[model samples]
Target: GELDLPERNLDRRELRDLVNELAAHPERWAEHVMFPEEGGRHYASLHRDAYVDVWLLCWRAEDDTGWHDHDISSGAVRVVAGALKECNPRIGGEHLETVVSEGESFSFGPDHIHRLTGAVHGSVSIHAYSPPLWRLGQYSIDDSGVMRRVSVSYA
Candidate 1:
């Protein structure tokens, strides 16, 4: 069978489906998984084409992506091993946390603000981003406790 990349940007649903499909076929990427000696997390680029870029990420317990948002690309992740905790901070409401375990998948829109922290046992996940990840908005709380967003190029 021939594998072809998308010709145009994929919607959120398509991104989810693509990741799900990749997750089910571990034989294709199982060998690429890696954990660095002094690392928090490491990722391998699996594929990149006209509209999407796919990656395989291995994380340690201390691996935390911090609070960030995809500027324009919608993304999805499929957990292949271990688990990850997803957190979404709210302005006036209670924050939310969800644990995504092995064999499970999750997706988010371009504007979704969240962070993913690795579990104690570590984790292996496949991520797919439509239109590729070009820019990101990283969030942090200042000394005054005000949340600030810093835009950074994904490159």
Candidate 2:
């Protein structure tokens, strides 16, 4: 979601607050929700400013985001409809899983690593990122469970 953004920067808290404000106003995003005809998910850009960018994401039943991080940007998610499951890996323990139901919100720091997968009946959510997401860190686990991260461009 590249745009002509200004030099201002938004902190993690501001990103959360922005998403909360947008979540409260469904009318701003509800009309823009549209599923992809042949992809696992689809997203529509909502708003962007000097320090932040917002999007409305639509997920299908088979959609899944493997372990990943937002690189340098902090973000927040507000579930607009249905439910989505988020999994945070732990150190030598069970991963922490959350079912973010409709109207619920979730936020994390820039360094947080997690995987988000589709839930029943698919899902819709509003996501906001500070400084916008230009790069992403994707994780891969080998057969012996050795995890590695590879940086990928979002452009």
Candidate 3:
């Protein structure tokens, strides 16, 4: 069976509903996708381009993604299985961190920067992006007081 997403005319609420549907059934996608290379034992289920693009990520323990931003697209993530630990920038003193367990989720608008990682055991997450996720700005901060944003393609 194939899932189709109408990219050109989906509102935020529509996208949210789709993500919720996927999150409710992680097992349906477990064996059908290829994981990305940045994280250990991670996989990407589906990536399609329409008015928007949707991507599914599956991860095992110790899997982690580097600090990055989703370019100009707005995105939401639903945790299907296990937990995800998000590391956010420091506000005043220390970096902010949050653990999103199974069945939990979050969303971000343009330029929202953060790093996502799997729990110490494993996890699965579904992601939806408006205007599709094409190029991204991978971030790096040097010791010399400079922040570098590298443009990258999602493979």
Candidate 4:
């Protein structure tokens, strides 16, 4: 069965409590949500009323996300299970990648822009956002000399 996510306005403390609740049972809901496909990835379900939508993301080997930014929302993620890696842009010719293990998590606000990739071990994460996720800015670079930003629906 799919886990029921609340659809009410949640304060900072309430959001944290929600994360804690999901983190308590990572394995229970991890397999429910679907992952995004190639050239297209998985995203959380949309919840109206401006509340937060929760998802349990499970990834296999080589699954990843593009460099993108949330349109107008800040979020926190708790790594319930598995290992995942993230690639961050850098100044020089090198990029920085970080790996997150089980029981570890991170939070990001509007200013956060990064790409996420899952390791071979697979991973499950519970994400929470405020005011709901409506639109997002997806960053893309073309072969020419142009950088493009595309707006997408978060739902």
Candidate 5:
């Protein structure tokens, strides 16, 4: 075989497929999946490379990451067990749109921003990020009706 495929930039669909595939193999990460006693979330790194990284995350009710955006990364997340909810600001207002559920997965480019919260039943998910996560932009609305963005470490 003298054929070599040219490497192309990773797309959201490809990222989503990667996470979905990983989710199908729970045995590899199930042991690391854990929920916090106080109704929070836990996470463990599963794989990492110069081109991509994977993680196993657990969620319980009341656990929410608020609205955040991955800086310089395109990511995909697949719910392997239970259910979870994702909220994104509506295009024209502050209204949040609920997305994601059991057996559901989605992907977004670097510029996409959204918030993910543990559903009533909680959840376990696998995440794949291209270029590995380095930083994130957390968003919040102040009482004065202003939106703010803060830079934070991926850790």
Candidate 6:
């Protein structure tokens, strides 16, 4: 069952609550959603109102989302099936600093640079983003180690 979500951009707390609502219905999101044919990748779009996007993603053991940020929007992510690890520059180093289990979640503003993965087991998550995910940026480093960003169609 899809949610009758808010029609406007949600604040952090609302975003968290919204994702939590999705977390409770794992079975509802298991079908008719996008799943990459390739192994070790996952992404799905569940709802896309004019002002928001609700998405679902999965992880295989050792799958990862390279360092990136939601271009101009803030977002929230919550685990539904297994374990997820989140990393951000604020924690420093290349190691993931937080591990969230089923029913746990986190929120971020537009300025946050982070990545996510499930290195130990397969997992699932629900995410909600303001502004419909049009300005996604996938980041990388060059030889000199300077930072750079590549535009992602949906980030």
Best by TM-score: 1
**CA-only RMSD, every prediction:** 2.2, 2.7, 3.0, 3.6, 4.9, 2.7
Question: What value of lDDT does candidate 2 attain over all alpha carbons?
Answer: 0.80
Ten-residue region with minimum lDDT total, candidate 2: 1-10
Better of 5 and 6 by TM-score: 6
Query: Candidate order by TM-score, highest to lowest?
Result: 1, 2, 6, 5, 3, 4
Candidate 2 segments exceeding 4 Å error: 1-7, 48-50
lDDT of each: 0.84, 0.80, 0.72, 0.67, 0.76, 0.78
Off by over 4 Å in 4: 1-17, 26-49
C-alpha lDDT (0 to 100) for residue 75 of candidate 2: 89
lDDT of 4 by residue, 61-147 (tens): 777678877777766677777878867777573878889778777776667777878654356667677767677788887998467
lDDT string, candidate 3, 111-133, tens digits: 68888875646466788877677
| Selected candidate, larger lDDT, 1 vs 2 | 1
In candidate 6, what residue range of length 10 has the lowest lDDT sum?
32-41
Regions more than 4 Å wrong, model 6: 32-40, 90-96
RMSD of candidate 1 to true structure, Å: 2.2
* Regions of model 1 farther than 4 Å from truth: 1-3
> For candidate 4, which ten residues in a row score worst on lDDT?
40-49
lDDT for position 135 in model 5: 82
lDDT computed for candidate 6: 0.78
Candidate 5 lDDT at 117 equals 84
Q: Name the weakest run of 10 consecutive residues (lDDT summed) in model 1.
A: 1-10
lDDT of each residue in 11-44, candidate 6, tens digit only: 7678888889877765658783444557657777
